[PDB]
Each structure stands twice: as C-alpha cells, then as structure tokens.
RNA sequence: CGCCUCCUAAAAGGUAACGGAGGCGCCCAAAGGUCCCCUCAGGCGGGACGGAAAUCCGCCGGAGAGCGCAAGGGUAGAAGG
RNA sequence: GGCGACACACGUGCUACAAUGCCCACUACAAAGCGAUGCCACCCGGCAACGGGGAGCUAAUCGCAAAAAGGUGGGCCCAGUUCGGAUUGGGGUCUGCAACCCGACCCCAUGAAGCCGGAAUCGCUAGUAAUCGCGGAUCAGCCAUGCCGCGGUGAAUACG
RNA sequence: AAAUGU
RNA sequence: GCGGGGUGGAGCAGCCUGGUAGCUCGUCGGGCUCAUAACCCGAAGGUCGUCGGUUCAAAUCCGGCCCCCGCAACCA
C-alpha cells in the first residue's frame, strides 16, 4: 500500500443498544450504532415489529352474525 | 358511518336472495336496487347487478371488499374527460 | 437516524422534535415521554443515550412508523383503486375523495390551475 | 387557529366540545 | 493478514457448507471472494464545486482506502460533459480490507438502510457476480450526519469465482447476504 | 348531398365599435336516405342561445341549401 | 486555373476530356525526442441518483475503434491511450 | 339517480400567512332569545364525540350557560414554525327506514398552498369602522363559513 | 387629450 | 446560368462567429365601460422547408431534394 495518503486502519469496537458489540476494525477505535444485524427487524427472525395487523380485512369483520333467519 | 351498536344495515329482502342461493343452488344474475345495502359475507362469490339510476351494473364480489356498500361499485355519474 | 430512522432536531423540546417523526402528532409526542419518563420540556441535545434508546425502543415498536407506514397508507389506497368502489376511482383520477364540491376550488387535490382558451364573450 | 378543530380556539368556532375544550 | 470475524467465517463455516451443497473435487473450484469495488457516479462535480474531495475523504473513512478518481472517456453535450473531466470515484477493495468492509456492510451498514426490506435477489451478473446499489452514505458507522455536507450514494461491485448464479448465491447467503425472495 | 357525416362551427364575431352583430352556431349534419328532405333539430341547452333569434337562424341554415357545393 | 486523396488508367510507371466524387492555403511546446506501462469499437448481463449514452463489474469480441482535419495506404507484434 | 358533475371562468364569503402572535393552565364582566317524543343540570362509563341513569322547569322560579376577546401564570423564539388547517389513511359517535353517491361530529396519523397578493376594485364619519364571542328562525340530522338579531372591547380622519 | 351604439 | 431566401397565426431578428430562438401585431385568460374599440395586467404558441453529413452538440457549418425572390439569356 502507498504511503501518506491512505488513513489507518486501527482494530475498532462497534457497539450497538441492544449490547452486541461487534470487533472489528475501522479508521474510528469506538462506534455506537443505533441500529444492527443482531437487532434489526428482518434480520432477527419474523419479528413483525407491529403488522400482524393485517391481512385481517376484511372477512374476518363478524360484529356479528344477526340478520334475521 | 352507521353506529357499530346498531345492526350492519343490509335489506332483508336482499339478504334473504344470497342466503336462498348458498342451499338451493348458486349462482345467478341478482338485480337489485340496494346500494344501501352493505357487502355480507356470504354474497362472496356472487354477481349483483346494481342500479346506478337507469341501469344494472353486473359487479363480481370479492373477498377484499366486504365492509362496503353496492352502490360504491356501480357509479352514477359518467365523465370520461373535458375538452376531448 | 437515531428515532426511529430520521434524525430529530435538536435544540428543540422533544415533544416537538417527536412531531418531526411521520407516525408522530402532538399526542403519541406527549405519551411516549410519560410513558418513558422524560420530562418533554428537555432539549433533545442535552439527553443521555439510556434516555434515547429507552425512548427510542418504546416508540419504535409501539406504532409502525415512516416507511412501512408509508406503505400500509399506500396499500390502502392501493386496494381501494384495486376493486374499484367509488372512493377507490376518484384516487385514480386525482379527484376530492371525501365527496366535496369540484366545480370550483379542489386545487389541493388538482395540482395547480390550468386555465384554458375556454368560451369568449361578445365583441 | 379558529379552523383547526385540534384547537380550544378551533372547537369554540366550530361549537362542539371534545379532548381539546372539554366541559 | 489478520484475523478478522467474517474472513474466519468463510472458512470454518462457509467453505464446507459449500463443499456439502455442491460436492466439489477440488479446494480451489470452490467459491472465493475475489474483490469488492465501490463505485460513486458522483458527476455532480463535473464543473459545479468542481472538486469534491469530500467523496474521497469520506470513502477513505469507509474503507480506508483513497479512491482512484474516474474521468469522462468522452464529451457529452446533453450530461454538460467535457472529455476528461472528474466525474466519478472508483476503489477496488481486496483480500482483508475487503473483508473488513463486507464485514461492516452486513454487520452494520445494510441495518441502517432506511426501509430495508432486503437485498434483490435478481441483481445478480448472471456469470456469478453481484452488484447493489446504496443512496446514502450515513450509513456507514465511521460517517455520520455532522461530518456530511450533501448525500451522497454509491455502486458495489461483490466479485466471486463462482462461475453461476446459484453457486454465487450460496456464497452470499452464508456469509450473511440478505435477500427479499 | 353528403357523402359522409361531419361537424364544423360558425362564428360572426365583429369588434369594431359596439355597433352590433354576434352570431354562433357549432353543427353536426350527416347524410340522409335519397327520398327524406329536411330535418332540423334545435340541440340547445337552457338559455345559450335565446329563443327570439331562432327563427332566423333556422332561416340562415335553409337560405344555404338553395346555392350547392 | 496551384496543391492533396479516390476512380476513370486497359493488374510496372505514366496517361486526356467544361469526365465521376472529395479536400488543402491550417495545425501541435506537446499532437515533439526517448524510456517505461497500457489496449479498442461494439454486443449481452449486472449496478443509487443516471437517461439510448456520464462512472463501476462480468462475459463475448483480430480489429469493424483510434491515429487533430479529405481520401487512400498503413497500423494493437502500434503508428492507438 | 340527479339537482353536490369538473378542462376552466366570475361574484359573495370563511380560515389564514403569524410574536400586538400561537399554545396550555387557572380567573373574571354581557345581552337578546329559545325550551313537554323540549331545554336537560347532577352523577357514572368513555381521551372524546357520546352513551347510561337521573333532579328540576308549562319556566324573572329550572335548563341551554362555558360567554369570547380580556386577567394572572408558564411554554414556544422567527422557522413553512407549537404559524397554517387543506389533503388523504385508519378507528369511531349521533341522527334517521337508510349516510356509496351525498350528513355532521369525535379521536390517532397525515400537515398542502399560503412569507400579506398584478392590472383593478369594496365598506365605513362614533359606540361607527375593526375585532371577540352569544342567540334565534329553517331544523330528524346537516354540509351556516349564509341569514336575521345581541352585547363585549373600541379606534383613525374629514383642509376642502 | 379620449372614438363609437342594427 | 449567377445571387438571395424558406423560423410561432402574419411580418421581420438570430445564421456570418455552433451551445442562448428574439421584436411588433395577432390569439387566449383577467381588468375598464351600460356596452364595444382603444387602453392596462398575465399567458399560450416556432420545434427553424425537408431528407442526409460534420460535430460532444447544428435554426447556425457542408451536401442532396422541394418551393420562392431578384438578375442574366448576347453576336444569332
Ligand atoms: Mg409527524
Ligand atoms: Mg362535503
Ligand atoms: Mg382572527
Ligand atoms: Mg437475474
Ligand atoms: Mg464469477
Ligand atoms: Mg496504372
Ligand atoms: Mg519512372
Ligand atoms: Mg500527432
Ligand atoms: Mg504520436
Ligand atoms: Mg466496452
Ligand atoms: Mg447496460
Ligand atoms: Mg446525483
Ligand atoms: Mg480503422
Ligand atoms: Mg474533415
Ligand atoms: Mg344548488
Ligand atoms: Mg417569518
Ligand atoms: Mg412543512
Ligand atoms: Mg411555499
Ligand atoms: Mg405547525
Ligand atoms: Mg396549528
Ligand atoms: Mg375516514
Ligand atoms: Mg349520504
Ligand atoms: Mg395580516
Ligand atoms: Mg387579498
Ligand atoms: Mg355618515
Ligand atoms: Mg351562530
Ligand atoms: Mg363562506
Ligand atoms: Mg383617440
Ligand atoms: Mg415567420
Ligand atoms: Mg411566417
Ligand atoms: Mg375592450
Ligand atoms: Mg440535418
Ligand atoms: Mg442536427
Ligand atoms: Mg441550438
Ligand atoms: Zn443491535
């Protein structure tokens, strides 16, 4: 590799909030993420955030079964 | 919209035509003139000719479009465009 | 991009900055900051990251938000046009859905005024 | 203002009561 | 080199899982990564701000690496472009850097797409090579939203010696690539 | 007669100093059976054209016929 | 009306007509000398903005590209970058 | 079913573009008028619209009813904003046989044009103009921001 | 200064 | 034969010197007036005759076709 122009490559910790760290390296020693791999809604399982909603309309409607007969 | 607490507002008289085809035999052509009426249920599957204020618009009934009422499906007033 | 994938402003009272969220009015703003234990008068630059991603997680998870709300509200709108009812057409054409009056004004709905050589009057 | 219903001011214009001018 | 989480990964996990899938006779027939090229159209700094160094320091961040400048082979009247002129950045990421890159690209950088509903599973060369697109660069860990001045996305080029589609897919996805469908 | 149905306007339209005449009439005549004649029809809507001018403009249509293509 | 390229020109050279078609009266301080490296047009697939065409990747592709400007000859085993 | 259409054009209007403002809490001073399948206090369920009960009043007796601007206090800090409330999604409430055409209201999300308006043009000489709310007739309900009324605060200028 | 009217 | 030209609806710029179509009238929408014209505010419209070349790029440079204007066709 050329020297003086290129930025070092130093063995970096990228923490995140759910607490996975990962090691790795980078140009920054210490990173926290918002967000990662470990965590992260269509990497972790079907974690469907909120929508089961869902396809429930619309037949699943019933309220309720009173027509006269 | 109507009040939950209140009964889903179909006609009888039309309720009582999709309920008689499901045992005796279905389907048919059901000319109506109850866009009051909303979409049962059991009128999936079916075809309801609907008034629009001169004629019958034959309309399929799909399983996605239940909780609505006939006469969104058969519009009353033609366009098309302007200046054309 | 820290809640929930939009970065909200700083200098500004969290209950407001909140707002900034699409999924977020004055009310969900106020509840998530009771619910979480954050005095909503604080300025989001002055936060500790525990308060964040306690307020992050709450927030996050409680109502689906920004994007994949973008879709369900377009998918409704999607399914309307689909079959297609009467509220469902006049989303194709671009028209007022909430039945109101078009001969006149509907501009938000009809994009800008696009006058026209129409009739003329006497000489 | 007096045409946001999400208003005391809005809801006193309009003349209903709600969340938002309670009685 | 170095020991590094995803380049160890390849070998004591991926590898034979290959091997297992695809019945291999020879260690060398098996699926490397050969390397990783970013790419960033940029163009906007044909004349307007004419140069942006911005780009190259922040890719530099990204992969520690300083990119090489691309030019226009030819002028075009319609794009406002002059033959030579700066239009683009292009790095070729190799062996550990190239590993500690896709590292932070799975682990990290595709997490912090907004709206990620997974990688297309079509972008695919056909001949065994993958390639997606990024529109924005916060999304790496070393950039944030103080050091940028104007969005800025990028094209990845995933080389592989997976001489079909399907042996390359295999490749990515035990690595950690994920796809939609 | 006509070898095919049309659809032309015409317009008396004469600015020059409040004195008078103002005349429009759009049409759409189309070919007859070689035995009928003549038929009219007065196509207006409400009050577009006013009701005291419509013998003379059923008159100004018939006075045309006289003269050929 | 002088000059250049092609044909006419009958397979050496040359060869006429108010015969058939084009171009020149410049240019480049690198578009020069040398050493070193590099290889095109195009086609298919792939890729944020980015299009038919900007930049990136893969595969096919002996030369149909390029050689400032006409045409011819030459030419990547370089005269091309 | 339509009179509610929509490429467009004019009239009358309502709400705005903000800090003499907007928001939230608490705290005041009107007037005219209406009210027995009516006004409905008071309590309970509901963030609410409202629902469940339930006291009174043929009403200078009871109810509509809180007037609003204002007053004290706190927030916002000049931004398309805690300005702006159009547009759309979603879940509801009430009336009525029934709310798709085509009702109004409540709540969550949404948060558009608009940074004071070209040529032109309207009203008003005093408790007037401006501004703030209240009532009523029509009336199941309501598209009233219309109309007819009532009071609160309360200016500028008129050489000619 | 400033035209015209079946 | 020689020279010039063809561009919004009309009449004219830009052409040489390649990158940008402009001026007056007209048309359309809005004002003024009882009304009309004048007059005031705002808009819309050319895809540069037409085929090929050159060029990164052509109304513009080159060539071929098609129209038009002017001049010339003398000794005979
Ligand atoms: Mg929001
Ligand atoms: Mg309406
Ligand atoms: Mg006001
Ligand atoms: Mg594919
Ligand atoms: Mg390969
Ligand atoms: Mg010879
Ligand atoms: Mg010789
Ligand atoms: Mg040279
Ligand atoms: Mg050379
Ligand atoms: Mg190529
Ligand atoms: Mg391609
Ligand atoms: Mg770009
Ligand atoms: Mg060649
Ligand atoms: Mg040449
Ligand atoms: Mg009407
Ligand atoms: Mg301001
Ligand atoms: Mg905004
Ligand atoms: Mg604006
Ligand atoms: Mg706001
Ligand atoms: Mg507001
Ligand atoms: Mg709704
Ligand atoms: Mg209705
Ligand atoms: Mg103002
Ligand atoms: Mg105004
Ligand atoms: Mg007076
Ligand atoms: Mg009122
Ligand atoms: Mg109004
Ligand atoms: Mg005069
Ligand atoms: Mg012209
Ligand atoms: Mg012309
Ligand atoms: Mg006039
Ligand atoms: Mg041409
Ligand atoms: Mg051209
Ligand atoms: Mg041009
Ligand atoms: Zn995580």
């Known amino acids: ?69 | 919209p109507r009040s939950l607490k209140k009964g889903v507002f179909v006609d009888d008289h039309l309720l009582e035509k999709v309920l008689e085809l499901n045992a005796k035999g279905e389907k048919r052509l059901i000319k109506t003139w109850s866009r009051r009426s909303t979409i049962v249920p059991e009128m999936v599957g079916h075809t309801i000719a609907v008034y629009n204020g001169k004629q019958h618009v034959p309309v399929y009934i799909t399983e996605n479009m239940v909780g609505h009422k006939l006469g969104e499906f058969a519009p009353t007033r033609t366009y098309r465009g302007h200046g054309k | ?123 | ?23 | ?181 | ?69």
């Open chain 4, 1 to 23: 203002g007096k045409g946001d219903r999400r208003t005391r001011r809005g809801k006193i214009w309009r003349g209903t009561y709600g969340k938002y001018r309670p009685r």
């Open chain 6, 1 to 69: 007669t006509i070898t095919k149905p049309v659809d032309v306007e015409g317009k008396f339209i004469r600015q020059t100093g409040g004195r008078g005449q103002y005349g429009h009439v759009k049409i759409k005549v189309e070919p007859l059976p070689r035995g009928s004649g003549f038929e009219f029809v007065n196509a207006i809507v409400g009050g577009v054209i006013p009701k005291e001018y419509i013998p003379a403009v059923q008159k100004g249509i018939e006075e045309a016929m006289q003269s050929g293509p």
């Open chain 1, 1 to 69: 590799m050329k020297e003086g122009i290129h930025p070092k490559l130093v063995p970096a910790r990228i923490i995140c909030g759910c607490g996975n760290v990962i090691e790795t390296y980078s140009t920054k020693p210490e990173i926290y993420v918002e967000v990662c791999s470990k965590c992260h809604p269509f990497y972790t399982g079907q974690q469907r955030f909120v929508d089961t909603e869902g396809r429930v309309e619309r037949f699943q409607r019933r309220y309720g079964d009173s027509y006269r007969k």
């Open chain 3, 1 to 123: 991009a820290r809640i929930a994938g939009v970065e909200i402003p700083r200098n500004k009272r969290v209950d407001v900055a909140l707002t900034y969220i699409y999924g977020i009015g004055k009310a969900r703003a106020k509840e998530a900051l009771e619910k979480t234990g954050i005095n909503p008068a604080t300025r989001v630059k002055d936060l500790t990251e525990a308060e964040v991603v306690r307020l992050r997680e709450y927030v996050e998870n409680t109502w689906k938000l920004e994007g994949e709300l973008r879709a369900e509200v377009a998918a409704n709108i999607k399914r309307l046009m689909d079959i297609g009812c009467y509220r469902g057409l006049r989303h194709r054409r671009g028209l007022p859905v909430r039945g109101q009056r078009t001969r006149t004004n509907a501009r938000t709905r009809k994009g800008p005024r696009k006058t026209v050589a129409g009739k003329k009057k006497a000489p």
């Open chain 5, 1 to 181: 080199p170095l020991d590094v989480a995803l380049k160890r990964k390849y070998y004591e996990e991926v590898r034979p899982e290959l091997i297992r899938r695809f019945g291999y006779q020879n260690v060398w027939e098996v699926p490397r990564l050969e390397k990783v090229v970013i790419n960033q159209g940029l163009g906007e700094a044909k004349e307007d701000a004419r140069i942006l160094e911005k780009a190259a320091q922040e890719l530099a961040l990204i992969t520690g690496q300083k990119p090489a400048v691309t030019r226009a082979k030819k002028s075009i009247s319609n794009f406002k472009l002059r033959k030579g002129m700066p239009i683009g950045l292009r790095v070729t990421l190799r062996r550990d850097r190239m590993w500690i890159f896709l590292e932070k690209l799975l682990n990290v950088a595709l997490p912090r797409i907004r709206d990620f509903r997974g990688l297309n599973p079509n972008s695919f060369d056909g001949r065994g090579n993958y390639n997606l697109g990024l529109r924005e660069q916060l999304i790496f860990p070393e950039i944030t939203y103080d050091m940028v001045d104007a969005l800025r996305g990028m094209d990845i080029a995933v080389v592989t010696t997976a001489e079909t589609d399907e042996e390359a897919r295999a490749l990515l996805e035990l690595l950690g690539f994920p796809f939609r469908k």
